[PDB]
Amino acid sequence: KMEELFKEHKIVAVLRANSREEAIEIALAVFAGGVHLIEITFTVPDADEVIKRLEMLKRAGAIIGAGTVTSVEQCREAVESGAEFIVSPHLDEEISQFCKEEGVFYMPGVMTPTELVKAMKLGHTILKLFPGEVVGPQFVEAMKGPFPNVKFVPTGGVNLDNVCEWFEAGVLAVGVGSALVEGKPSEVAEKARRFVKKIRGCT
Amino acid sequence: KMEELFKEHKIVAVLRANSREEAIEIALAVFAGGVHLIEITFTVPDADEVIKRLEMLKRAGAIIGAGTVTSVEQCREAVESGAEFIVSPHLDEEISQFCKEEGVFYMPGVMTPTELVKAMKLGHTILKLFPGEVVGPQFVEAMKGPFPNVKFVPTGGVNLDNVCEWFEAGVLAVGVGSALVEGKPSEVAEKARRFVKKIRGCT
Amino acid sequence: KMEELFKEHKIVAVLRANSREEAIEIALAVFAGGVHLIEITFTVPDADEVIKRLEMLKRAGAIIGAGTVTSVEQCREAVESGAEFIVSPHLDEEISQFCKEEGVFYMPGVMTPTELVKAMKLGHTILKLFPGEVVGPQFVEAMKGPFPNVKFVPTGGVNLDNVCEWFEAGVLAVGVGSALVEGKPSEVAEKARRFVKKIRGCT
Amino acid sequence: KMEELFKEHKIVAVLRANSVEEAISKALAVFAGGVHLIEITFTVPDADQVIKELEFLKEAGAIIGAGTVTSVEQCREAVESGAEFIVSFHLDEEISQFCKEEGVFYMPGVMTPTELVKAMKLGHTILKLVPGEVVGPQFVEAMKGPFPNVKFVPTGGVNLDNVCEWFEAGVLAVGVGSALVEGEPAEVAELAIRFVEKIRGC
Amino acid sequence: ARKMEELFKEHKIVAVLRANSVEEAKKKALAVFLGGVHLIEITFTVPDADTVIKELSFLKEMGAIIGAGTVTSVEQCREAVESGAEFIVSPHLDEEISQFCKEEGVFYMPGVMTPTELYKAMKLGHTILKLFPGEVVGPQFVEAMKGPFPNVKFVPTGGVNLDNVCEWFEAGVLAVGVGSALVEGTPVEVAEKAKAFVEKIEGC
Amino acid sequence: KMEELFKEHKIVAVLRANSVEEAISKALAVFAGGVHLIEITFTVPDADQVIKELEFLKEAGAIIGAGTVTSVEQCREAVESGAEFIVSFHLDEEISQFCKEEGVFYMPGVMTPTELVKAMKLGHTILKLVPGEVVGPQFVEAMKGPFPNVKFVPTGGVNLDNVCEWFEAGVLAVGVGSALVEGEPAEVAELAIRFVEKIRGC
Amino acid sequence: ARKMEELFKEHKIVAVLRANSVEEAKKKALAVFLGGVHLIEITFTVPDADTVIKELSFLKEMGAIIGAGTVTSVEQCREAVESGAEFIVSPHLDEEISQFCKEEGVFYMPGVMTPTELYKAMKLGHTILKLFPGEVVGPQFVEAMKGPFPNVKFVPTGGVNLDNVCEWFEAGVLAVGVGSALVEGTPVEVAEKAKAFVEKIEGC
Amino acid sequence: KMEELFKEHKIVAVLRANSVEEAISKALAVFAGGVHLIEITFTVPDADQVIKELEFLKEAGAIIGAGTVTSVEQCREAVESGAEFIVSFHLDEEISQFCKEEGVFYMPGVMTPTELVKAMKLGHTILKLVPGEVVGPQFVEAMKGPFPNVKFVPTGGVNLDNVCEWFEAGVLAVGVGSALVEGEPAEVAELAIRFVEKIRGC
Amino acid sequence: ARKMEELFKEHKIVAVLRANSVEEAKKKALAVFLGGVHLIEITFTVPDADTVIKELSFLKEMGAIIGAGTVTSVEQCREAVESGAEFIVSPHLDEEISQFCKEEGVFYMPGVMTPTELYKAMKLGHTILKLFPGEVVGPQFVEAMKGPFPNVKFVPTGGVNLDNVCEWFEAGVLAVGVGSALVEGTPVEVAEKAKAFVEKIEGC
């Protein structure tokens, strides 16, 4: 159950790479850093050939999903490859219906009041807020009032200086697609440890 | 006519409460403070009991509506309860058509250029801008150019320091659902006086 | 080919006027300042009389289009008048079909991820960001990961101090609807030169 | 330099207006049309206002001087006003001394061989030939024999219809004035474009 | 002698007279006078011109205005002045004659052809210039000079006939000097020609 | 502590590489797989680069020592490198003095009873048994009779198929080395996981 | 040197010769002479103009007269005089050249275009004047100056060809200055053109 | 003598117990079964009680010594206790001096050629080979080539199934230990008999 | 005496000879020599080994290499050296013998079995070690020691026969010592066995 997994870890790797090899080296650096929730953006060359080969980490408690899924064809490949969850940059309907039938956790992207309501009426209680750096924590606070039953996972602009502010506002988890991926495997692992300690400290 | 009432008062209470009893007592404290335009968020326990039992203030010049309406069922109840106007956090189609048939003033929520245009094509000349604290007065200034016939009522992010800035940009009225409602009645009425003086001074 | 022209000049006049005489005087001041890409907001009284008249400058290397087109009827008139391209404040469906059939370059307005995706699926590789001053360069920075093949032309929020910042984020061109139009013809031409020099300096 | 500018542009516009604002609107339309050499008549009302107001065009590559300067006092004022060159209708020793000292390019007007073999002695190689409509292209060509080292910028008698013919006779540039400097700013720009394109060919 | 400007404006035509004798000059002067031409210029190309100028003084009381032309020296000018000429006209610009005429209070109109000569004439205080030969440059010269010389009036001589006498004035001309087109043939023919010139001018 | 760490993890990986970058990639895969005890062979090319580079893993709970150290000079370098423990293939009194003074855990290698009852005299309770392929688990079990207070960490002859058998004989930890440390980082991590899963059971 | 008036009157046509070399100038001078044109002007726009003038002196015994043209300075004039030039011709009116020529006793013909210097030229003692360019000022000038300047002889230069040569002579000009129309092409062609000019002039 | 006793009996039983009474019951069962050479483990609890209690067996022709002696102090105690011979796992010059002075038969343990050609120098002709299950009978036979004058009493890896094979390799006696010394006294006696009967044949 | 390393590599086989007499030793030593085994080790288990070494010296000229084995003392070594032995071999590691042999310039190859002994042997400067008994540890030992001892070569003795003699070399072996598998039976049988061993070794 993804809802419980998100609460337990409160952070997502949001992995990006330009190759199969980079994606694997990064995934190991991140996982070893204490970050269990990992998704691979479906832009990585042969991204599906990476997801299917991280089964070994699932056995270690890792959760492997796929990100930046914009169409159902990409979703179908990700699901067949063993993706545990699907994340979109926007709010589709075709992907949602497909995932629903398959039983795959799906999280649509939103930014506006109308997108929120539409997604809510489709049974989505967890929404991805993107770009998060544009609207900021005030968006979540504003929505909390009229929509107390909607949880958010903001992605982008998240760093060690403002990660606690997001949690103070009240979020489920934070997506870090820069400070938790850029650099060498040895550097990434260090960054991962800083994020885990900082989040645990504040919450 | 709501258009004239908004121009005359330039302020909306945007009331919230955790109970039927609180909503009534607060509404009176606010009205006594010089704020005639009051809407009750339709999330308050027994909100319909509150609205229908304030049918005494209308004779005093009070205007009573219902806000945070997301469904047609909520709208229908609010209208039956004697609500003069309906305000939504989003742009619906069903509520709008219902209100038109009933003859009830309706104000949809918008945030984007597309949402604005769609609402405009439905005959809405006054739009609710929400969250106001995210986009700020610059949004209104930008829209003034291409959409000179569209008026805004921003809600949220409004306080005694920046209220004149909103009016300088050019708005119809300001929705204050925090700075003028939080606390207890003996303080809320005083806050109301400061808001009235500040708005009157600048405009 | 407009795509190449935008890249070469990197700046758009975004002309606005209260009369045909003003529009002509401004267009000459701007063109003389080194700004070849000029679009006329189709709100100017007898705007079509300006578009058809300034066609004389096409021989001089000027490119003249029409902006602030909200409906197909306005588009049709602008195209008949000799407009080379059409720019909308929002993302329509009817205008793009008309323009496609005519072979007229069309650039829709967007603000949110959903709009970006919808427009992308309609074959639009260049999008207008409006209002630009609300989202800022951070929107462009974000929309590079999931959308590596989408170019943007922000309008508004552009001045002589932050023009380089926009290009650093990575934009195709900048629309200046204030500092490149307000003032006397002798002042406008001077402002235009400063914009050109600053852009050439940084890029 | 100037000589190089005449070779590069080959055309001079002469502005005359009943106001400063009018002069600016026309000057801008002319510049936009592709004409960088602008002469401001200095015998007009006000006069000492237009040169200053058009200063902003210099940064755009415009070169602005003072036309119909007939006296030394007018010349001095024109130079102080920011004129980069002085143009007259007759040869004057005092002007061809003050301008020299100040580093200001000056060109006298001529009509006969006897005026030509005088300006040359003072050191003038570029002469303004007037009235162009009286002497015609024949003057420019005929004088080339004995005076192959003299260049002309004739004014008057020149329009699009015969602009090529003037260049065939052999001139450095043509002064067309009101030929393109007339009507609304839009019309001025249109005519300026036609002249530039017409010349760029022969 | 500034009154000449007004007199030229009133008549707009000058008869230039040449002859082989006094009697011929006298008959021609009367013929143009009767024909409506009151501005009579007697040249000195005729070796009896002084006699003609003096004798014709009888017409002054009848409203005739008599002067002398083709004066090419100060000494000749002096004789013209003594003869009773009201105005002196020269084919060229001449400082020595101008200064003499100025001192004697005699109206003088120098001849010019080029912009540089027009300029020099201004320093002598001349507001009216004779354009000669008019047939070489034509009316376009007068128009061309309005720019640099907005306050200078011209009186062209030659190139003027009944076919173009009207258009000559469109250039902003004060008066026209007419030669053999006006003065030639019998006294009767001269008077008839004079009538034709006056009638056409007084109308356009 | 070390003695407790061996008891808790029960597995030690031994890394070798032809480059530092290779060593780091493998070390990370091994750690990710759940193996916290890492031995870096100190007889490799460069050698004194890998221990420093892997410093970042220590913060994650990794323990890194130096393998196949035979000389005191190598021990000194390994200690300066920040090695947490030193492991050899033979018993040496000078090494079992330097390491003691520096507070650095050290364990000698043994193969026979006469070496076992010597290392004990020097205060060693944990011995490295080599070659595992030659003596087998029977050596470990048999020696536990007369010497119940001696623990072994046998290296070599250890695979998934017989990893439990070694623990049945009675060892504190097993030295797997190349048994899992081979192939691509992805393959290394998989094998590291399999060993951990297999051990957790007996 | 009044003999020049007689020579201009008798020969009527004067050839104006230009070249980029001495060798070409010589070939042309000979062709022109053989064609029946005795009056030859060697311009100063040719390299080693002095060499050209001197080396053609052999034609003097054949009845040829060699002068120098396009002289714009006293120094150039002196060099031409020292080369045996019979006469000096200038494009303009020049007092310094005139005085030099008078002292040397060399015939000088200044250039004019307007009535004003025409007057001055007379006062300097010059009765024969060069009218230039003839491409701009036509025969109407000659048939006009006669009035005020009845004793001036003109020699129009330029604008003269085989079609209008009679028109100039009908105006009473002393001589015509012809270049390019006569002096062009090969030595044979030049002589042939020169013959054509002479024959037509004699016939009118 | 000992040397003669090994040749005569060809078998040694090694006893271990958690009590003195247990040791006695087993010792008697083993002796009754026909095994006269008894080695008492001296690393047991109490230890210095069993040798004295079994004194009564000496009169029956039993020969009782002490095994698993690793230290000099243990050796001294074992001799004082009435042990007639001392057996160790390693060669020790202090033990192979005290025992010599006291007239006590002693044999060191060996596993390698470098230990064998050392004990021989001190005068040991009978060596204990350990662990027998690690080297096997091939060691005894192979070493007979270069060292034909060395006899072994291997312990470990010895059972009824292969007891003859050990004698074929060429040993003076076999150390069986727990091979027969296990279970109830009745079972111990039975196994003791089986070993005696099996050996008497090859 | 480093040349021994090359000699071992060239032949890859050593005969380990034992006998109960000088006659048996000579016949057996010759039989293997004839069969192609040049490297012959004479043990001291033979009660005339010194005599055997001396008497067989005649084979040295034929390419035979004669040394002595099973040396367990310095005094015994001394006799072997005096007898003409080129190399000394021991079943164990012995410092006293090594030092003696080193001083005398005699190649000495000590026996080892465990990693600690391999290490100690390095302090004496040995590069070639005898592994004995080979059958106890097997080829896996030689491979295992390549890590810690990358510069040490081995010569396994014992456990070597025609069913594994080739395979032994796959472990990275310099040469193999063969006992009764090679030296046993009649002079004829011994020579035949020697040929079989050499023929099979030459392959892997």
Numbering used by the authors:
A (entry chain G), B (entry chain E), C (entry chain C): 2 to 204
D (entry chain B), F (entry chain I), H (entry chain F): 2 to 203
E (entry chain A), G (entry chain D), I (entry chain H): 20 to 223
Task: Show sentences the authors wrote.
Here, inspired by the pseudosymmetry observed in bacterial microcompartments and viral capsids, we developed a hierarchical computational method for designing large pseudosymmetric self-assembling protein nanomaterials. We computationally designed pseudosymmetric heterooligomeric components and used them to create discrete, cage-like protein assemblies with icosahedral symmetry containing 240, 540 and 960 subunits. At 49, 71 and 96 nm diameter, these nanocages are the largest bounded computationally designed protein assemblies generated to date. Here we show that designing pseudosymmetric protein building blocks, in which symmetry is broken at the sequence level while backbone symmetry is maintained, enables the construction of very large pseudosymmetric protein nanocages.
Unexpectedly, in a number of the GI4-F7 micrographs we also observed a 71-nm nanocage with a similar wireframe morphology and hexagonal pores. By counting the hexagonal pores we found that h = 3; thus the nanocage is T = 9 and we refer to it as GI9-F7. GI9-F7 can be explained by the presence of small amounts of ABB heterotrimer in AAB heterotrimer preparations. Analogous to the AAB heterotrimer, which forms a pentasymmetron through five roughly two-fold-symmetric A:A interfaces inherited from I3-01, the ABB heterotrimer forms a two-trimer ‘disymmetron’ structure held together by the same A:A interaction. In GI9-F7 this disymmetron occupies the icosahedral two-fold symmetry axes, providing the edges that connect three-fold-symmetric facets containing three ABB heterotrimers and three CCC homotrimers. As a result, GI9-F7 is quasisymmetric in addition to being pseudosymmetric: the A, B and C subunits each occupy multiple, distinct environments in the assembly. The asu of GI9-F7 therefore comprises one AAB trimer, one ABB trimer and one CCC trimer. Micrographs of SEC-purified GI9-F7 assemblies revealed enrichment of the target assembly, and we determined a cryo-EM structure of the nanocage to 6.7 Å resolution applying icosahedral symmetry, as well as a 4.0 Å resolution structure of the asu. Consistent with the accuracy with which we designed GI4-F7, the GI9-F7 cryo-EM structure deviates from the design model by only 11.5 Å Cα r.m.s.d. across all 540 subunits, 1.6% of the nanocage diameter, and superimposition of the designed asu with the structure yields a Cα r.m.s.d. of 4.6 Å across all 9 chains. As a result, the two designed nanocage interfaces (B:C and A:A) occupy five quasi-equivalent positions in GI9-F7.
